[PDB]
Amino acid sequence: FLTAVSSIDTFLPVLNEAKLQWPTSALAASSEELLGGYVGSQFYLQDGKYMQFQIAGSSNRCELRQMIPDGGSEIGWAVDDGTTHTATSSIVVPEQVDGVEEVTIMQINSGEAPQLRISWIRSKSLDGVAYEDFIMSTVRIGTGDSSDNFVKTHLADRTAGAMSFQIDVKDSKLTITVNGNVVVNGQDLSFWDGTDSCYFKAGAYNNNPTSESATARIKFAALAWVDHH
Ligand code: NA
C-alpha cells in the first residue's frame, strides 16, 4: 500500500502550484488531481515524510511543473520581469542504481529550452577537476548544443542526509545556495531576457542512462516556489 503525498500537509502548497508530468512531458496530472490523492510507485510518500519520485528510461521524467496557484493555468515568467522568483527544496539523493548516470532534480525551463538544470551526476570532469557522485548546475547561455552554450558548476558532493537548495532569479541574475552555502552568485541570464515563458520544475528527469530499466529515485523533504515583489 502506497501512501499519497497529499495525505500530509507538508507538500500541499507546492502541489497547489504544480502539475505532474509522468512518464514524459506530454502526459500530465493536474494540481487538483495531485491534491486529490494522486499516488503511484512513481510518486508517493516514503517513510511518512518524503515526496519520492521514481522514473526509468532515457529522458523520461516524473516531474512537477510550476502552475498558477489554486487551479490556475501554466505559469510563464521572465528573468527580467522585476520580480524575484525563488524555488526552495530539501532533497535526499539516495544511491542511484547502475545505469543511472544523471538525474535532473530542479529546473528552470521555458518554451525556448532549459535555462537551468540542477542534477545529480555519477562522474564528470569540470574545468580540469574530476568529480564523482555530485550535484551540478547547468545554465544555458546560448542555444547551440556544444558545451560552450552552457556554464556548468560543481555545487556539492552528494550527502548522506538531506541537502537544501535555493534558486533565486532576480533582474536577469541567478544565485544558487546549497546547504546554506552560496555556490553560484550573480550568474548572468540576460540571454533569456524577454523569454516570458519560464517556470520552475522539480522531481526526477533521467538523463542519458546506460540502462533503460534502471530506475532513478529522488526524495524531497520539502519543496516550494514563490514570487516576491
Ligand atoms: Na532512501
PDB file of all heavy atoms in Angstrom, residues 91-94 133 135 156-163 179:
ATOM      1  N   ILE A  91      16.375  17.834  -0.219  1.00  0.00           N
ATOM      2  CA  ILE A  91      16.394  16.631  -1.045  1.00  0.00           C
ATOM      3  C   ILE A  91      17.346  15.607  -0.446  1.00  0.00           C
ATOM      4  O   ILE A  91      18.493  15.934  -0.124  1.00  0.00           O
ATOM      5  CB  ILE A  91      16.818  16.965  -2.492  1.00  0.00           C
ATOM      6  CG1 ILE A  91      15.910  18.031  -3.102  1.00  0.00           C
ATOM      7  CG2 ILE A  91      16.817  15.720  -3.372  1.00  0.00           C
ATOM      8  CD1 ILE A  91      16.305  18.457  -4.512  1.00  0.00           C
ATOM      9  N   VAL A  92      16.886  14.368  -0.332  1.00  0.00           N
ATOM     10  CA  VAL A  92      17.766  13.236  -0.122  1.00  0.00           C
ATOM     11  C   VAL A  92      17.933  12.552  -1.461  1.00  0.00           C
ATOM     12  O   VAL A  92      16.963  12.039  -2.030  1.00  0.00           O
ATOM     13  CB  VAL A  92      17.230  12.257   0.935  1.00  0.00           C
ATOM     14  CG1 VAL A  92      18.108  11.003   0.981  1.00  0.00           C
ATOM     15  CG2 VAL A  92      17.177  12.913   2.289  1.00  0.00           C
ATOM     16  N   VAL A  93      19.159  12.562  -1.972  1.00  0.00           N
ATOM     17  CA  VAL A  93      19.503  11.795  -3.163  1.00  0.00           C
ATOM     18  C   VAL A  93      20.090  10.477  -2.673  1.00  0.00           C
ATOM     19  O   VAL A  93      21.215  10.475  -2.142  1.00  0.00           O
ATOM     20  CB  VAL A  93      20.483  12.545  -4.074  1.00  0.00           C
ATOM     21  CG1 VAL A  93      20.757  11.707  -5.314  1.00  0.00           C
ATOM     22  CG2 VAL A  93      19.944  13.920  -4.426  1.00  0.00           C
ATOM     23  N   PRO A  94      19.373   9.370  -2.777  1.00  0.00           N
ATOM     24  CA  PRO A  94      19.930   8.091  -2.352  1.00  0.00           C
ATOM     25  C   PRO A  94      20.928   7.607  -3.397  1.00  0.00           C
ATOM     26  O   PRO A  94      21.119   8.212  -4.454  1.00  0.00           O
ATOM     27  CB  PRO A  94      18.690   7.198  -2.286  1.00  0.00           C
ATOM     28  CG  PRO A  94      17.832   7.700  -3.389  1.00  0.00           C
ATOM     29  CD  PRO A  94      18.036   9.202  -3.381  1.00  0.00           C
ATOM     30  N   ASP A 133      29.856  11.503  -8.072  1.00  0.00           N
ATOM     31  CA  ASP A 133      28.697  11.367  -7.197  1.00  0.00           C
ATOM     32  C   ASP A 133      28.340  12.716  -6.580  1.00  0.00           C
ATOM     33  O   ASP A 133      28.424  12.921  -5.368  1.00  0.00           O
ATOM     34  CB  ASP A 133      28.988  10.310  -6.128  1.00  0.00           C
ATOM     35  CG  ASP A 133      27.771   9.906  -5.333  1.00  0.00           C
ATOM     36  OD1 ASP A 133      26.638  10.124  -5.776  1.00  0.00           O
ATOM     37  OD2 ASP A 133      27.959   9.344  -4.245  1.00  0.00           O
ATOM     38  N   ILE A 135      26.421  16.949  -7.216  1.00  0.00           N
ATOM     39  CA  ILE A 135      25.332  17.792  -7.680  1.00  0.00           C
ATOM     40  C   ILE A 135      25.930  18.943  -8.476  1.00  0.00           C
ATOM     41  O   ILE A 135      26.851  19.619  -8.001  1.00  0.00           O
ATOM     42  CB  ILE A 135      24.490  18.330  -6.511  1.00  0.00           C
ATOM     43  CG1 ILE A 135      24.143  17.228  -5.487  1.00  0.00           C
ATOM     44  CG2 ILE A 135      23.239  18.993  -7.054  1.00  0.00           C
ATOM     45  CD1 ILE A 135      23.378  16.060  -6.038  1.00  0.00           C
ATOM     46  N   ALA A 156      28.081  20.582  -4.996  1.00  0.00           N
ATOM     47  CA  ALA A 156      28.336  19.861  -3.759  1.00  0.00           C
ATOM     48  C   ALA A 156      28.411  18.385  -4.079  1.00  0.00           C
ATOM     49  O   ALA A 156      27.688  17.892  -4.942  1.00  0.00           O
ATOM     50  CB  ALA A 156      27.206  20.081  -2.747  1.00  0.00           C
ATOM     51  N   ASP A 157      29.240  17.670  -3.343  1.00  0.00           N
ATOM     52  CA  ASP A 157      29.191  16.222  -3.407  1.00  0.00           C
ATOM     53  C   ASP A 157      27.899  15.724  -2.754  1.00  0.00           C
ATOM     54  O   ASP A 157      27.375  16.339  -1.819  1.00  0.00           O
ATOM     55  CB  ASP A 157      30.420  15.638  -2.727  1.00  0.00           C
ATOM     56  CG  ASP A 157      31.702  15.924  -3.500  1.00  0.00           C
ATOM     57  OD1 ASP A 157      31.650  16.202  -4.725  1.00  0.00           O
ATOM     58  OD2 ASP A 157      32.774  15.852  -2.874  1.00  0.00           O
ATOM     59  N   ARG A 158      27.372  14.612  -3.262  1.00  0.00           N
ATOM     60  CA  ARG A 158      26.144  14.072  -2.699  1.00  0.00           C
ATOM     61  C   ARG A 158      26.360  13.738  -1.231  1.00  0.00           C
ATOM     62  O   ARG A 158      27.372  13.143  -0.866  1.00  0.00           O
ATOM     63  CB  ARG A 158      25.724  12.818  -3.469  1.00  0.00           C
ATOM     64  CG  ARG A 158      24.399  12.223  -2.976  1.00  0.00           C
ATOM     65  CD  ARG A 158      23.913  11.065  -3.826  1.00  0.00           C
ATOM     66  NE  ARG A 158      24.791   9.912  -3.738  1.00  0.00           N
ATOM     67  CZ  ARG A 158      24.658   8.916  -2.875  1.00  0.00           C
ATOM     68  NH1 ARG A 158      23.658   8.873  -2.006  1.00  0.00           N
ATOM     69  NH2 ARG A 158      25.560   7.949  -2.873  1.00  0.00           N
ATOM     70  N   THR A 159      25.387  14.090  -0.395  1.00  0.00           N
ATOM     71  CA  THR A 159      25.456  13.813   1.027  1.00  0.00           C
ATOM     72  C   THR A 159      24.519  12.681   1.416  1.00  0.00           C
ATOM     73  O   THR A 159      23.522  12.387   0.755  1.00  0.00           O
ATOM     74  CB  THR A 159      25.125  15.057   1.863  1.00  0.00           C
ATOM     75  OG1 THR A 159      23.825  15.558   1.521  1.00  0.00           O
ATOM     76  CG2 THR A 159      26.164  16.134   1.676  1.00  0.00           C
ATOM     77  N   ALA A 160      24.862  12.056   2.536  1.00  0.00           N
ATOM     78  CA  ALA A 160      24.019  11.018   3.105  1.00  0.00           C
ATOM     79  C   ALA A 160      22.664  11.577   3.515  1.00  0.00           C
ATOM     80  O   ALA A 160      21.630  10.929   3.321  1.00  0.00           O
ATOM     81  CB  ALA A 160      24.728  10.418   4.315  1.00  0.00           C
ATOM     82  N   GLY A 161      22.657  12.760   4.128  1.00  0.00           N
ATOM     83  CA  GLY A 161      21.442  13.359   4.625  1.00  0.00           C
ATOM     84  C   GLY A 161      20.842  14.357   3.647  1.00  0.00           C
ATOM     85  O   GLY A 161      21.359  14.619   2.559  1.00  0.00           O
ATOM     86  N   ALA A 162      19.706  14.908   4.067  1.00  0.00           N
ATOM     87  CA  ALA A 162      19.004  15.889   3.261  1.00  0.00           C
ATOM     88  C   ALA A 162      19.899  17.084   2.970  1.00  0.00           C
ATOM     89  O   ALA A 162      20.655  17.551   3.829  1.00  0.00           O
ATOM     90  CB  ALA A 162      17.739  16.351   3.982  1.00  0.00           C
ATOM     91  N   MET A 163      19.788  17.576   1.743  1.00  0.00           N
ATOM     92  CA  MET A 163      20.554  18.700   1.241  1.00  0.00           C
ATOM     93  C   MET A 163      19.572  19.787   0.835  1.00  0.00           C
ATOM     94  O   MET A 163      18.637  19.524   0.075  1.00  0.00           O
ATOM     95  CB  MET A 163      21.371  18.232   0.033  1.00  0.00           C
ATOM     96  CG  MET A 163      22.136  19.328  -0.683  1.00  0.00           C
ATOM     97  SD  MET A 163      23.251  18.688  -1.943  1.00  0.00           S
ATOM     98  CE  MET A 163      24.619  18.127  -0.937  1.00  0.00           C
ATOM     99  N   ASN A 179      22.783  23.757   0.950  1.00  0.00           N
ATOM    100  CA  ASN A 179      23.078  23.588   2.371  1.00  0.00           C
ATOM    101  C   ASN A 179      23.464  24.908   3.030  1.00  0.00           C
ATOM    102  O   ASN A 179      24.297  24.959   3.931  1.00  0.00           O
ATOM    103  CB  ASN A 179      24.130  22.508   2.601  1.00  0.00           C
ATOM    104  CG  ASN A 179      23.540  21.134   2.588  1.00  0.00           C
ATOM    105  OD1 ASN A 179      22.336  20.968   2.771  1.00  0.00           O
ATOM    106  ND2 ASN A 179      24.374  20.128   2.398  1.00  0.00           N
TER     107      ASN A 179
END
